[model samples]
Target: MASMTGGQQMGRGSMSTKAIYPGTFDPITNGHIDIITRAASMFDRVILAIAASPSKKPMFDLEERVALATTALQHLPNVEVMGFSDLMANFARAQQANILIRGLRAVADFEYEMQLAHMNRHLMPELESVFLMPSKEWSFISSSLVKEVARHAGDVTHFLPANVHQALMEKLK
Candidate 1:
């Protein structure tokens, strides 16, 4: 029997690559799904931890956000959706995940994302932050933008799933 030095040992002595993608996910968008799918392909398990970002005053409640994300990502077998209100680093440590997945849509998001990544690293040095670039189709989409568009009666069907779209429509109406 050999000891696993870096990765976590899973069932049958197989090493596991678990990563956490923490976000407010007010209403999980296509861009988010894209990133989650991409992370799934690279890691053994991807935990989509939805944050209780009261500060952001999210459009969707924590439970609603979690449900939306869970539905949107249900197709990914290795992806898990959960909600948390604690510090992200602490959550990541509790999950025993060594990788923190972040989505970078464009150059404008780099600086802020890098700053958060650095702070997260300081809190949990063992957790490495991995930045992933979103697909071109989603590069210009964001939750805030989607909400704003939908609020003003603009079509956001392309940015969100059918369930989220209906929810957004109901919420806005």
Candidate 2:
């Protein structure tokens, strides 16, 4: 977090807060990057937290996702990558981040995110969940959709972060 006069720089001359952004990140996409950038601008620091799902077959593993997140967020001074299999609220609390950053793409996303937000609130009353709109370029991007289309050799570049896009392509080959 950049500071002026030894004070935390934040909104409207107030101290900014630290936030944690959690996602499966099978392969970090452009939409993910968009949210991370927007979140970083709003918060003092953001941890790109990755969650694991045994039911899903991710294109990349935990270490791969971390590397991809690092490359995608290389420009962010206050962003770090981490992996966890626990609940998001637990992960957020573990990192000492009081805020959770999420992105909205459409109505469907809103419904799902809303439910998750409610659940998190129920579990962790202290954690605040914040939402951001996805960039127009990535409004339709999703890891599941990207993976599905990419499996058929479709162009997933428009949706994925540069590094992850290339990595996925190589892995699919």
Candidate 3:
């Protein structure tokens, strides 16, 4: 929210625009970072909620996911990395988030997210769902895809943050 004339920031007042970006970031990748960076800029406050998604059989536990996301997003003053284990609609309500940020990578991702957005709207009619398209370079990169490549020693360091890359390598080893 940059301005040429150095004006006042409205959203930073008492009731800030809090956004919730919920996901089970087992090992956060650059694509995720891209979406977060955009959210951090747009919203006065952004909570990156890491879920305990045991159903996904995540490679990293909840604590590890939260830590990795925190480390990766440390520089953003408006962004916070938190761990949550509940129905996301409830999570959104508990956090008092006015906006829910999502990453839209492709048509497949779109078709999939469309249903969820509608469902979320039904769950909480006031909570807005906002989608940020992937940065040009990271549209194809996902945590599972990177993990799959690195599991076979395929060298996916370029797709992950330095600490995440190290953790992935060490875990694989």
Candidate 4:
């Protein structure tokens, strides 16, 4: 129902504008943080949106996810945390987001998201999608991977922030 076209709506603004990075963020990860932090440095502001849903029974609920994201990325002056369940096309327009940033893990991930990008274009053209490639160190990491490791009662979960990793430890218990 959001089908429309209008590049004139965004991709231009004062002091630059905002980019959105949306995901479940069941628990924030250092890899995820890296993407948002760099995006903040480029865009005037960055919104870390939680695409919340319950069908998957995400371990961390929306509020918990928001709090963890807030705590871990607080050092990023230009990043703001938010939660949403609406269609991304709808959300992007509502947020006046000129850019939609997606993580590009260095692997066989793009083809699927590439299909996703095409659909988003039809739904909303003004909001262009940009794939932010992951840092070499984080190329192999994911929120699921972190959760997987933690659930096994392992002492490590790749590269989560100190607080987030601790929260995972608590959640697993």
lDDT tens digits, residues 60-106, model 1? 99999999889889989999999988988999999999899998877
Per-candidate total of colliding backbone pairs: 0, 0, 0, 0
Please give the ranking of all candidate structures by TM-score, highest first, separated by commas: 1, 3, 4, 2
lDDT of 2 by residue, 18-108 (tens): 7999888888888888899888888899999887664677778888888888888898898898888898898887878779998877886
| Alpha-carbon deviation at 22 in model 2, angstroms | 0.5
Cα lDDT, all candidates: 0.90, 0.84, 0.88, 0.84
Candidate 2 Cα outliers beyond 4 Å, as residue runs = 1-16
Clashes of 3: 0
Query: For model 3, how does the per-residue alpha-carbon lDDT over 1-173 read when each residue is reduced to its tens digit?
Result: 45666444345454568999988887899989889999999789999998886586899999998898899999999999999888778898998887999988788677889999999989988688999988889978899999999989898977998999999999998
RMSD of each: 3.5, 4.9, 6.3, 5.1
- Note the residue pairs that clash in candidate 4: none
Q: What's the distance in Å from true for residue 132, model 4?
A: 1.0
TM-scores of all models? 0.89, 0.85, 0.89, 0.87
Better candidate by lDDT, 1 or 4: 1
Q: Where does model 3 exceed 4 Å of error?
A: 1-15
Candidate 4's residue-wise lDDT over 1-173, tens digit each?
24685335435454457889999888878889989988888889899999788468888889899999998888888899999989877898899887898998755777888988999999988777988888988877788887887788765646899888888888888
